[PDB]
Amino acid sequence: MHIDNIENLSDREFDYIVVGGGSAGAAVAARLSEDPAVSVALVEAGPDDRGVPEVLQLDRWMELLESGYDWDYPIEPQENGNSFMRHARAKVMGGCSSHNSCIAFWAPREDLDEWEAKYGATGWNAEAAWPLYKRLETNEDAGPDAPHHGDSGPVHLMNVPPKDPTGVALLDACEQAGIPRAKFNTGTTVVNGANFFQINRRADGTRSSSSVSYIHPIVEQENFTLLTGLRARQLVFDADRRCTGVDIVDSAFGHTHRLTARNEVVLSTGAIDTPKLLMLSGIGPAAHLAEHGIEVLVDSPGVGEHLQDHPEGVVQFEAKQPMVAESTQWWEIGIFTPTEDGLDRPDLMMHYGSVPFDMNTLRHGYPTTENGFSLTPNVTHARSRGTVRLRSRDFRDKPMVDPRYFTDPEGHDMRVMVAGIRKAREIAAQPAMAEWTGRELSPGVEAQTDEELQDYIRKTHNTVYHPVGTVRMGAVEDEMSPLDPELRVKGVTGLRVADASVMPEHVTVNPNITVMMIGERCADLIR
Numbered sequence: 208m209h210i211d212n213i214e215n216l217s218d219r220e221f222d223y224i225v226v227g228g229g230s231a232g233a234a235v236a237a238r239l240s241e242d243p244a245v246s247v248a249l250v251e252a253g254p255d256d257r258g259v260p261e262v263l264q265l266d267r268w269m270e271l272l273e274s275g276y277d278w279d280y281p282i283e284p285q286e287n288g289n290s291f292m293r294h295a296r297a298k299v300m301g302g303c304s305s306h307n308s309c310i311a312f313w314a315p316r317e318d319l320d321e322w323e324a325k326y327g328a329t330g331w332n333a334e335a336a337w338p339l340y341k342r343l344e345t346n347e348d349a350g351p352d353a354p355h356h357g358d359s360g361p362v363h364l365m366n367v368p369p370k371d372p373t374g375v376a377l378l379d380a381c382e383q384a385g386i387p388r389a390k391f392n393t394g395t396t397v398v399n400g401a402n403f404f405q406i407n408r409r410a411d412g413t414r415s416s417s418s419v420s421y422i423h424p425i426v427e428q429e430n431f432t433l434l435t436g437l438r439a440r441q442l443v444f445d446a447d448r449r450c451t452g453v454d455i456v457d458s459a460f461g462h463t464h465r466l467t468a469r470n471e472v473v474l475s476t477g478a479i480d481t482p483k484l485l486m487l488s489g490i491g492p493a494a495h496l497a498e499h500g501i502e503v504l505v506d507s508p509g510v511g512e513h514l515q516d517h518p519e520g521v522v523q524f525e526a527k528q529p530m531v532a533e534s535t536q537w538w539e540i541g542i543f544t545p546t547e548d549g550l551d552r553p554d555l556m557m558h559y560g561s562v563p564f565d566m567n568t569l570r571h572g573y574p575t576t577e578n579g580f581s582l583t584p585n586v587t588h589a590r591s592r593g594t595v596r597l598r599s600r601d602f603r604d605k606p607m608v609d610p611r612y613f614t615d616p617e618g619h620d621m622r623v624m625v626a627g628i629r630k631a632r633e634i635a636a637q638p639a640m641a642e643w644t645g646r647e648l649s650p651g652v653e654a655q656t657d658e659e660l661q662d663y664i665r666k667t668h669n670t671v672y673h674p675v676g677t678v679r680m681g682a683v684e685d686e687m688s689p690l691d692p693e694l695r696v697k698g699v700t701g702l703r704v705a706d707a708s709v710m711p712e713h714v715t716v717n718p719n720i721t722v723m724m725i726g727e728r729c730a731d732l733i734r
């Protein structure tokens with residue numbers, strides 16, 4: 208059942224409570240509910256997405272940025288970055304799977320294998336993840352010639368059709384620059400290669416969000432309770448520091464209600480809101496909690512530390528012919544290439560967007576167009592590390608999000624981004640793109656030196672919208688990892704975290720499907 212008025216829920220005790228109906232949370236809640244003897248509550252601050260066209264129709268996604276569907280988290284002033292940048296985060300069932308571009312990737316095996324081998328996360332490797340990617344998806348590429356693929360899972364992945372002529376020409380241009388066409392999600396990492404994406408979208412244009420995929424089919428299940436429009440303000444603990452449930456409100460100034468869990472509570476509020484909720488509940492860096500008058504239940508210094516992202520630059524071009532006016536999601540191609548020899552993962556990625564992306568260039572006076580395209584390089588393994596911290600002890604105050612972009616001491620992130628702008632220019636300049644590439648609008652051909660491109664990047668960079676890593680898993684004995692390898696919050700019992708917070712190291716690719724995989728694995732670790 209769907210509860211949209213908490214005042215009518217009389218029995219508020221469940222076996223499991225999942226907090227946050229996002230990419231991971233929806234998956235955890237649905238998988239736990241597959242046992243009819245187990246009762247599960249899924250609590251989400253935003254509305255139900257059922258029948259909401261702006262959310263459901265993927266090609267409308269860019270309209271959700273800074274809408275009522277967006278928590279809208281501006282960042283703290285950046286030491287070496289864009290202080291105007293905003294971390295858009297969805298406030299709606301499905302979480303960011305309901306506001307995103309649906310770019311769908313399996314993580315490289317080399318990334319996942321390292322979670323265990325390098326970062327102490329016992330049991331987290333490609334052997335554990337491959338069957339879960341299979342289980343979660345219905346992939347267009349499924350079949351005996353690609354037996355790793357799922358053909359039955361809730362999350363539908365399809366290939367973006369090569370309809371966009373500028374896209375086709377860009378791929379031809381990649382080939383000329385020595386970047387071959389490569390299939391994505393084959394099980395083998397693409398180090399040097401490019402193509403139209405796979406996207407998690409259904410045939411009819413509906414995003415295959417975690418809510419559409421996992422939740423809509425089960426809303427009437429007898430053992431499943433969906434609670435929307437309800438915002439968690441604190442986790443509640445014993446006595447013996449067992450998490451017994453969660454305090455929620457239906458409106459900022461209203462009565463506090465509580466839901467209780469007999470077995471466990473799973474926190475899935477994502478990489479920004481998770482560390483915030485833990486800190487408000489007394490789990491976090493002791494000095495920071497004390498500063499805000501919060502009783503320290505667990506001194507957990509890794510909470511809100513190790514914030515990682517894929518920082519993003521932009522190169523914008525006027526197009527010499529009419530650009531496409533229809534799309535799956537306006538960002539249909541990805542390009543991977545290594546900037547150095549010896550790599551088993553690309554250190555650089557670029558997206559191609561069939562629109563001019565002027566979000567951060569217009570304010571700095573760069574020219575605009577209504578007929579143009581963008582190439583957006585990102586750093587796949589940024590070395591910079593930031594924080595999420597409390598602004599105050601009041602749950603209604605937005606957290607302080609400081610990614611510390613381009614602050615890594617060896618200057619890796621900036622070096623790769625500069626290479627990325629140069630590589631974007633190189634691809635755009637190939638013969639196959641001669642009939643497309645017009646004037647470069649930003650940074651503009653006048654920007655040529657390392658220094659000029661660095662200044663431009665600092666002023667105008669965005670994000671691919673991939674904050675991760677703020678409540679990382681790690682070795683039981685590592686004090687700076689708030690979670691053990693089974694996602695259990697250290698220092699407390701009955702509480703796990705499952706969402707993008709958990710990643711010890713960012714993945715090379717767009718993380719959404721991997722975060723769904725994290726939810727699948729959390730369900731399994733529990734059951």
Ligand SMILES: *Cc1cc2c(cc1C)N[C@]1(*)C(=O)NC(=O)N[C@@H]1N2C[C@H](O)[C@H](O)[C@H](O)COP(=O)(O)OP(=O)(O)OC[C@H]1O[C@@H](n2cnc3c(N)ncnc32)[C@H](O)[C@@H]1O
Pocket residue numbers: 226227228229230231232250251252253295296297298299300301302303304306307308309310311312437438439440475476477478480484671672673674705706707708716717718719720722
């Ligand atoms: C937002 C966004 C995200 C992404 C992209 C663009 C944009 C604008 N681009 C690409 C994408 O399309 N594919 C991809 O692989 N990566 C991109 N994408 C990032 C992913 O979408 C993102 O990493 C995952 O969605 C993260 O999932 P996770 O489960 O970690 O978090 P999510 O935000 O989905 O769910 C959290 C839910 O929790 C609710 N919430 C938050 N705070 C509370 C409180 N206090 N009480 C109750 N619920 C609460 C949020 O409303 C979310 O539903």
